[PDB]
Symmetry: C2
Subunit: 250 residues, 2 copies
């Protein structure tokens, strides 16, 4: 009802968690949607969305999104059609289905989206977590960004397998590195994004030579704190950040 | 003596760095290096009438010795080395010497020039000129020797550095890890306002694992590998500005 935790709704067990405030990241958003057919229809729902919470699950090849915004029936009614591949609304809930995408508006301020393979979660199962949320575990700063609405426009990512990810961000061919979770926080500076990340190292030590070289490939400050590798003052353009976000599914 | 001379025998054996610059295609770099030390036009004017420059840097006595082949008519030489620019001259055979605070210059024949630059311990000019008659015999790697004989057909700059450790860190702008390595060969060619280069660096018992190898190749954006105990980098790049600074910083 009023106490809904968006992260409880996308669900636990994901490989990547995403928090994406729209204000201040409109350009990044528009760059990402430029590939899809529904790009006219999506930029509409997006214009009515304040924040997007997302979880990606590799095993079932799916993304689940929860949006906070304003979605009256009059607005949803226009966008939805059979000409765009959809089928379908009922007891205050607008429910929509296509080959690879499910959408529902369970209330005037929430939207839910499941996209992916034929093994993606049923929508009624995701909606049940409005009554009985999951309890995923998320890093402190990720949690802070999620509750901090409007005082911050940081995009937050929590990626369980950082080794397998970090290759995409570093211009690498996929190497399979023996590293753990990464947190990644990005903020728009003009046509660019500043980022800071933390990487779990486990018991393997990272000496200064490697520390130095990474720092040069990335053009950023670098340091070890306990068993974490910390990268700060890194920068990436809005354009390359777009494709990297898309590569999660690909 | 005029019959034929080996410019490398004239600059002398035992140097810490050997250098070869063909002037065509490398005018800008040469200018930069000259500017980083000397402001006098005479040397710039000499360079303009030179086809090739052979150099040797000597760390102990802190000096460059340079041999230029070119065209230096009396009409040209008479109009440089003016006393108002701080040049003293002296006749004697018929060879004239030009001396200044840090630079000594001679033009022993209309097609040769000799320059000695550096500290007060720099070689005497007449000692260097004696090597027109009795040359030294420094040892250089094959490609360095190929470059020296191939003016007109190649515009590649060549360096041969005895202590490659110290130089490579300046060149790649790394920190000087200073676990001294062997000799370095370095060949560079001009592309716009930067230089393309390949190098090999003797490693010794020193080791370079694959992780560092791949990282360096990405840092430099160049193809790299290890042929034996030689590290090879191909298609690295450096700005002319930086290359001029790295060279000229051998002195002082």
């Amino acid at each position: 009802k009023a106490s809904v935790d968006p992260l409880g709704v996308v669900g636990s067990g994901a490989d990547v968690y995403l928090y994406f405030p729209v204000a201040g990241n409109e350009n990044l958003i528009s760059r990402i949607i430029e590939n899809h057919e529904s790009k006219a229809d999506i930029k509409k729902i997006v214009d009515r969305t304040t924040a997007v919470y997302g979880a990606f699950f590799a095993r079932s090849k799916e993304f689940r999104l929860f949006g906070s915004g304003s979605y009256p029936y009059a607005f949803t009614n226009l966008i939805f059609s059979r000409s765009d591949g959809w089928a379908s609304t009922e007891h205050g809930i607008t429910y929509y289905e296509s080959e690879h995408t499910d959408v529902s508006i369970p209330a005037p301020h929430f939207s839910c989206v499941i996209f992916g393979s034929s093994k993606r979660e049923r929508m009624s199962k995701m909606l049940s977590r409005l009554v009985n949320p999951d309890r995923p575990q998320l890093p402190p700063r990720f949690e802070k960004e999620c509750t901090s609405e409007g005082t911050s426009q940081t995009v937050a990512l929590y990626i369980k397998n950082g080794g397998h990810f970090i290759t995409k961000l570093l211009n690498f061919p996929q190497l399979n590195l023996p590293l753990g979770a990464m947190e990644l926080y990005l903020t728009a500076r003009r046509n660019e994004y500043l980022y800071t990340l933390s990487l779990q190292l486990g018991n393997a030590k990272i000496n200064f030579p490697i520390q130095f070289l990474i720092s040069r490939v990335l053009n950023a400050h670098i340091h070890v704190e306990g068993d974490r590798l910390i990268i700060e003052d890194g920068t990436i353009s809005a354009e390359r950040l777009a494709s990297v976000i898309s590569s999660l599914y690909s």
